Scaffold this motif. Structure first.
Motif, PDB file in Angstrom:
ATOM      1  N   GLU A  15       0.835  -1.189   0.000  1.00 33.39           N
ATOM      2  CA  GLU A  15       0.000   0.000   0.000  1.00 33.39           C
ATOM      3  C   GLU A  15       0.877   1.249   0.000  1.00 33.39           C
ATOM      4  OE1 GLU A  15      -1.414  -1.289   4.068  1.00 33.39           O
ATOM      5  OE2 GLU A  15      -1.869   0.851   4.193  1.00 33.39           O
ATOM      6  N   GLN A  16       0.231   2.369  -0.279  1.00 32.86           N
ATOM      7  CA  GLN A  16       0.876   3.636  -0.348  1.00 32.86           C
ATOM      8  C   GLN A  16       0.152   4.599   0.611  1.00 32.86           C
ATOM      9  OE1 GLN A  16       0.653   6.547  -3.968  1.00 32.86           O
ATOM     10  NE2 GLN A  16       2.486   5.216  -4.170  1.00 32.86           N
ATOM     11  N   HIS A  31       5.752   4.046   0.528  1.00 31.91           N
ATOM     12  CA  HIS A  31       5.408   2.706   0.044  1.00 31.91           C
ATOM     13  C   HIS A  31       5.619   1.700   1.137  1.00 31.91           C
ATOM     14  CE1 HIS A  31       6.226   4.158  -4.346  1.00 31.91           C
ATOM     15  NE2 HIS A  31       5.257   4.811  -3.729  1.00 31.91           N
ATOM     16  N   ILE A  32       4.660   0.798   1.316  1.00 34.44           N
ATOM     17  CA  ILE A  32       4.755  -0.153   2.407  1.00 34.44           C
ATOM     18  C   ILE A  32       4.502  -1.564   1.892  1.00 34.44           C
ATOM     19  CG2 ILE A  32       3.865  -0.818   4.660  1.00 34.44           C
ATOM     20  CD1 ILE A  32       2.719   2.179   4.853  1.00 34.44           C
TER      21      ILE A  32
END
Lengths: 262, 268
Positions: A15-16, A31-32
């Motif tokens: 996800e972002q 960003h993850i």
């Protein structure tokens, strides 16, 4: 003639986050990446990756593959946090130059000297959000920086050592501003005398980089290797045949093994 | 905090089904920001695309900006993948990558699991050559004399097979830890065929072969022995390089050897 169904790539377990810094209202794009594997009881290790737009997917894909067989690869499942910018390219020239530099360049150029404000953003704003949204092992945090990013990471090691338990420092721009960052190398042993956790430092450089970079990194490595302290574990790797742009993927797995907890 | 999805610039995803079997593929495409040279972009086809596409994409995007310094040409990346959330398919890649059928009399392991479907390499190559490539060449400016095939693992077995039997399909082969041992080293029965192919070759052909030094002994020996034989071929159409990644393993050789590989297959 034939058609194809056209689409956008959407990466699973990622996800972002869009975020603005409290103090300056500077926009970040985070960003993850979260592991498929369940968190250990103490939480996931976490890797903060500076220049997130340039390196995030590379860290994500390596961890996702290598962490499946941790006892073969020596790589732990970790959350990856790319600290990036709302840009289409790999690097945000002006923004990173400000964020990564601890002082204003000596005696117009782009603004420098924003490392304090950037470190505040990371510690006070980004980290609390990651820690509330994910199960983090706060004794197993890594800071990665390359370039000017490596300069910043070295600066944090010298001034805020306890913020991260591992430092993956790639081709740090130690030359920057007449080696002003090296003026705080003094602080390290004082910091180690009060460090909470054993601190891992992995330093890397490409052999084909410009002489001042290669020599500076080798000299720093000899100074860090000379330290004999329970709270510092140091490793140096000069990547033979590699240049300023290719040292990161080449050294990545050695770095991941060094920072991991298997 | 505003929650978003990561969307990468200058990339796209295609859904395709093979003509013959209706096999579903997920194709990932990266295009350089820099404009195509007059004769088109070099192109890299990456098998197990779900596993390796973004790594190729990121390295090319960074390194190709300063090509005289890095030796890396801007190239279109085509990840040849599957509609999956993981890095690797199971049965789909096993079928696609393997040129022969494992004997129906092959004994089972203690686990009692039937052998996976094998022998789809021919159909996969048909899908690549006749279906995917024209579609890429229609939608992008491709230099059809500057094409690379990358494969790791069972994917490297596939890439070795194509080198041995369909050399002209790509002008460079990046062959990472190829599963040479597969089916009693059946792929090596075609190794002698390489001279025939080299003597028909239009373009000089680049072959980069890599293995991690800490891989299983039989794999390390297999790749080293193959390297020695390929180094013995002394042909104007074959350019061969071998790299044993000291201290690396089966999963880590790819990123480690990536840049060496990109420099080898590039045109700067």
């Amino acid at each position: 003639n034939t058609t194809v169904e056209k689409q956008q790539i959407i990466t699973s377990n990622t996800e972002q986050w869009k975020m603005y810094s409290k103090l300056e209202g500077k926009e970040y794009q985070i960003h993850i990446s979260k592991p498929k594997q369940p968190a250990p009881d103490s939480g996931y290790p976490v890797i903060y990756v500076l220049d997130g737009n340039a390196f995030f997917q590379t860290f994500h894909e390596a961890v996702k593959i290598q962490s499946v067989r941790a006892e073969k690869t020596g790589v732990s499942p970790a959350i990856i946090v790319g600290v990036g910018y709302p840009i289409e390219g790999a690097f945000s020239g002006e923004e990173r130059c400000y964020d990564f530099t601890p002082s204003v360049i000596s005696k117009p150029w782009p603004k420098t000297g924003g490392a304090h404000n950037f470190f505040t953003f990371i510690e006070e704003e980004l980290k609390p959000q990651i820690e509330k949204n994910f199960e983090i092992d706060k004794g197993k945090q890594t800071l990665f920086g390359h370039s000017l990013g490596g300069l910043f990471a070295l600066h944090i090691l010298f001034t805020n050592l306890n913020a991260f338990q591992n430092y993956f420092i790639s081709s740090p721009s130690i030359w920057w501003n007449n080696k002003s960052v090296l003026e705080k190398e003094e602080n390290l042993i004082i910091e180690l005398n009060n460090a909470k956790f054993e601190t891992g430092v992995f330093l890397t450089v490409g052999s084909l980089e410009r002489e001042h970079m290669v020599v500076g990194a080798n000299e720093l490595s000899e100074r860090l290797l000379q330290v004999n302290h329970d709270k510092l574990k140091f490793k140096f790797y000069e990547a033979e045949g590699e240049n300023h742009a290719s040292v990161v993927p080449t050294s990545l797995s050695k770095g991941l093994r060094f920072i991991s907890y298997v």
